[PDB]
């Protein structure tokens, strides 16, 4: 009934954002993919051609295809240096690569496509070797890939050739993260209410299927996401539909009872992310449209609260360059960027309508649910966001917002 008016308001909002973009962004690229991605992750490696104003970064992409062949995609996005020579008047609607900003040699070009059974729910690379990449399948099992052992162009035989195939679930899920400190430790979260733990650093080269090392049954509702601590190799947290944030410790002989348990939100909780500089802070996003900050030294008091998301939240990512910045996204078409240091500041009386004093920036660049996004770990404050409308945006907010000269 209202599908006409909702489409109409989305159209007007996007056109307005396209009109008044140049004030808000130092750089945007709007690139249309072949199939929607439920994942995105900047690869840590960066290469800079000599005498050329653009670097060559790299992103890991999955496809959400109806029935036929899916892929694991590793695209290379060329970003400009600080000596870049480009335009900022509008986007372009004119050049055949993207929605205008940044170097003329800003052009996402696919490099590796790999057979993948079903859609790619989530693909996270393993920090100790960006060659190895894990994937999340809609089926029970969780796959692991190495793209060095695969042809750049997939063979049309359609054989899924994972380096390992990891089992231990009963349904699908979305939570999946490696331990950044200890090589081969992979956590996955699924609908079966269980956190299964794998280790691949100690598997035979002859065994192509690997059982889970351990299974955690703490959650009672559907588990949504799980993440390791970024300084402690043995500590990880998880969130679920049960509105419960639980903190787990590997050393515990009790794998069925968590070390901590917190009723973080009054609704579904979809995401969590540890602060990569303060080992004591973490945040979560939830279906109650609020992003709940937390302090690990006391889990009875919620450190702070963020609002102004109009719909659910499906992702939250701390900045890799500044400890005070994080971003979130959800079913609402907007990606918000928060600033911890601005908490408690007294803004002008009206601007409370735009949002709380710490709401640093809102991204109006996606016409559909933003599936996932990730900060670039090499070039500060450049974010690649994908959405259900077959769009892969990489953008960098305007410089003057984050700098008070």
């Amino acid at each position: 009934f209202d599908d006409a008016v909702e489409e109409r308001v989305i159209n007007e909002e996007y056109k307005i954002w396209k009109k008044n973009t140049p004030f808000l962004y130092d750089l945007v690229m709007t690139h249309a993919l072949e199939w929607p991605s439920l994942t995105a992750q900047w690869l840590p490696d960066v290469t800079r051609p000599e005498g050329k104003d653009f670097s060559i970064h790299r992103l890991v992409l999955g496809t959400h295809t109806s029935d036929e062949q899916n892929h694991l995609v590793i695209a290379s996005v060329q970003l400009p240096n600080d000596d870049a020579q480009f335009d900022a008047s509008h986007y372009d609607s004119e050049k055949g690569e993207f929605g205008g900003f940044g170097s003329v040699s800003g052009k996402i070009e696919i490099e590796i496509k790999i057979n993948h059974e079903g859609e790619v729910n989530r693909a996270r690379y393993m920090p100790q070797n960006p060659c190895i990449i894990a994937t999340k399948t809609p089926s029970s099992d969780v796959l692991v890939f190495d793209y060095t052992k695969h042809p750049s162009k997939p063979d049309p035989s359609g054989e899924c050739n994972p380096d390992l195939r990891l089992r231990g679930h009963q349904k699908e899920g979305y939570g999946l993260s490696w331990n950044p400190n200890l090589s081969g430790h992979l956590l996955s979260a699924s609908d079966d209410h269980t956190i299964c733990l794998w280790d691949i650093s100690a598997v035979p080269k002859e065994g192509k299927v690997v059982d889970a090392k351990t299974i955690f049954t703490g959650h009672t509702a559907v588990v949504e996401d799980v993440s390791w601590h970024l300084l402690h190799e043995s500590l990880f947290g998880s969130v679920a539909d049960d509105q419960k944030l639980m903190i787990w410790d590997t050393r515990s002989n009790n794998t069925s009872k968590p070390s901590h348990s917190v009723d973080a939100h009054t609704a579904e909780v979809n995401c969590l992310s540890f602060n990569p500089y303060s080992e004591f802070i973490l945040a979560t996003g939830s279906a109650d449209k609020t992003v709940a900050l937390w302090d690990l030294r006391n889990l009875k008091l919620k450190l702070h609260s963020f609002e102004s998301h109009k719909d659910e939240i499906f992702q939250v990512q701390w900045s890799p360059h500044n400890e005070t910045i994080l971003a979130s996204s959800g079913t609402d078409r907007r990606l918000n960027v928060w600033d911890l240091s601005k908490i408690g500041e007294e803004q002008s009386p009206e601007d409370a309508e735009d949002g709380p004093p710490e709401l640093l920036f809102i991204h109006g660049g996606h016409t559909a649910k933003i599936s996932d996004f990730s900060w670039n770990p090499n070039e500060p404050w450049v974010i690649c966001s994908v959405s259900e409308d077959n769009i892969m945006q990489v953008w960098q907010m305007a410089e003057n917002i984050y700098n008070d000269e």
């Binding site: 909002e13 056109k15 929607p36 600080d82 008047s89 609607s93 601007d351 709401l359 559909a368 410089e399």
Partner: protein, 192 residues
């Protein structure tokens, strides 16, 4: 076939796979489809260029390094945080602007016209019997080509008949129709 034809076959199949996605099609609509009444509001020389050049008429080029875009931005102010309140404000402003426009094609007068868009070349009202491009929504969703048959000036809609058989005659607002034949611009002095 041929290696070129097979390759171009692969491009065609890529595009077909892309367009079988309703959300991707909707995005294709939002990105490039502008009604004749929307084009003057955005696609002309936008307000960024006007304010930039009025603040620095001594600035030579409109394209240069991001480091000097930092200066050209700071020396304009801090852009407002674009939010739901900002979007509803701007949507109300767009309603006012396009109310102004429709007032202009009844051959009448309009706002004081301090806007940086549409100095005089207001898009003309549609003629009866021309081919226009519009978005048809419903049991047959998507963008289609059709012929115009009538005008509804009171509510600013149009009656169209499509060149696709089996679709028939439907009413589509003024701000969802595009005229294929070359764009017509006439000064506001003619509009009143």
């Amino acid at each position: 076939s041929t290696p070129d034809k097979k390759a171009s076959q692969k491009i065609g199949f890529r595009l077909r796979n892309l367009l079988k996605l309703p959300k991707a099609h909707k995005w294709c609509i939002y990105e490039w489809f502008y009604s004749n009444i929307d084009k003057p509001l955005f696609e002309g020389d936008n307000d960024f260029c006007v304010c930039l050049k009025e603040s620095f008429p001594n600035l030579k080029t409109r394209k240069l390094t991001r480091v000097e875009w930092g200066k050209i931005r700071r020396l304009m102010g801090k852009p407002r945080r674009c939010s739901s309140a900002f979007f509803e404000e701007e949507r109300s402003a767009l309603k006012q602007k396009r109310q102004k426009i429709r007032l202009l094609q009844q051959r009448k007068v309009a706002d004081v016209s301090q806007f940086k868009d549409l100095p005089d070349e207001i898009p003309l009202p549609l003629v009866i019997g021309t081919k226009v491009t519009a978005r048809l929504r419903g049991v047959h969703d998507g963008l289609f080509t059709g012929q115009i048959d009538a005008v509804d000036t009171l509510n600013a809609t149009y009656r169209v008949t499509f060149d696709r058989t089996g679709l028939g005659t439907h009413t589509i607002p003024d701000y969802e129709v595009l005229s294929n034949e070359p764009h017509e611009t006439m000064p506001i002095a003619a509009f009143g």
